[PDB]
Short mmCIF file of N, CA and C in Angstrom, two decimals:
data_model
loop_
_atom_site.label_atom_id
_atom_site.label_comp_id
_atom_site.label_asym_id
_atom_site.label_seq_id
_atom_site.Cartn_x
_atom_site.Cartn_y
_atom_site.Cartn_z
N UNK A 247 11.18 1.84 -26.78
CA UNK A 247 10.33 2.96 -26.45
C UNK A 247 9.12 2.53 -25.54
N UNK A 248 9.29 2.59 -24.24
CA UNK A 248 8.35 2.29 -23.20
C UNK A 248 7.58 3.56 -22.67
N UNK A 249 6.25 3.54 -22.53
CA UNK A 249 5.50 4.62 -21.72
C UNK A 249 5.89 4.52 -20.18
N UNK A 250 6.11 5.59 -19.44
CA UNK A 250 6.34 5.66 -17.97
C UNK A 250 5.12 5.24 -17.09
N UNK A 251 3.85 5.34 -17.62
CA UNK A 251 2.68 4.70 -17.01
C UNK A 251 2.56 3.15 -17.25
N UNK A 252 3.09 2.65 -18.38
CA UNK A 252 3.23 1.14 -18.56
C UNK A 252 4.26 0.42 -17.56
N UNK A 253 5.30 1.21 -17.16
CA UNK A 253 6.08 0.73 -15.93
C UNK A 253 5.29 0.33 -14.64
N UNK A 254 4.04 0.86 -14.47
CA UNK A 254 3.00 0.28 -13.56
C UNK A 254 1.87 -0.50 -14.30
N UNK A 255 1.59 -0.38 -15.56
CA UNK A 255 0.32 -0.72 -16.20
C UNK A 255 0.47 -1.33 -17.61
N UNK A 256 0.77 -2.63 -17.79
CA UNK A 256 1.08 -3.25 -19.11
C UNK A 256 -0.16 -3.67 -19.91
N UNK A 257 -0.55 -2.72 -20.73
CA UNK A 257 -1.84 -2.69 -21.48
C UNK A 257 -1.64 -3.15 -23.00
N UNK A 258 -2.72 -3.39 -23.75
CA UNK A 258 -2.63 -3.55 -25.28
C UNK A 258 -2.10 -2.48 -26.12
N UNK A 259 -2.22 -1.19 -25.74
CA UNK A 259 -1.45 -0.05 -26.31
C UNK A 259 0.09 -0.17 -26.01
N UNK A 260 0.54 -0.81 -24.92
CA UNK A 260 1.96 -0.86 -24.47
C UNK A 260 2.83 -2.04 -25.07
N UNK A 261 4.12 -1.80 -25.30
CA UNK A 261 5.04 -2.87 -25.69
C UNK A 261 5.25 -4.07 -24.72
N UNK A 262 5.56 -5.29 -25.26
CA UNK A 262 5.78 -6.50 -24.46
C UNK A 262 7.11 -6.59 -23.63
N UNK A 263 8.24 -6.21 -24.32
CA UNK A 263 9.47 -5.73 -23.67
C UNK A 263 9.30 -4.55 -22.62
N UNK A 264 8.19 -3.75 -22.65
CA UNK A 264 7.84 -2.77 -21.65
C UNK A 264 6.88 -3.23 -20.49
N UNK A 265 6.55 -4.56 -20.41
CA UNK A 265 5.87 -5.11 -19.26
C UNK A 265 6.83 -5.27 -18.03
N UNK A 266 6.52 -4.74 -16.80
CA UNK A 266 7.22 -5.02 -15.53
C UNK A 266 6.87 -6.51 -15.06
N UNK A 267 7.06 -6.59 -13.73
CA UNK A 267 6.34 -7.53 -12.89
C UNK A 267 5.65 -6.87 -11.71
N UNK A 268 4.86 -5.88 -12.01
CA UNK A 268 4.09 -5.00 -11.17
C UNK A 268 2.81 -4.52 -11.87
N UNK A 269 1.71 -5.27 -11.77
CA UNK A 269 0.41 -5.01 -12.45
C UNK A 269 0.51 -4.96 -13.98
N UNK A 270 0.11 -6.06 -14.67
CA UNK A 270 0.05 -6.14 -16.15
C UNK A 270 -1.39 -5.83 -16.65
#
């Protein structure tokens, strides 16, 4: 369960499997 804003923005509220390689 990934947020669609985490697809650009991998934050402390967001999952680690939900990190891209486009702005963490």
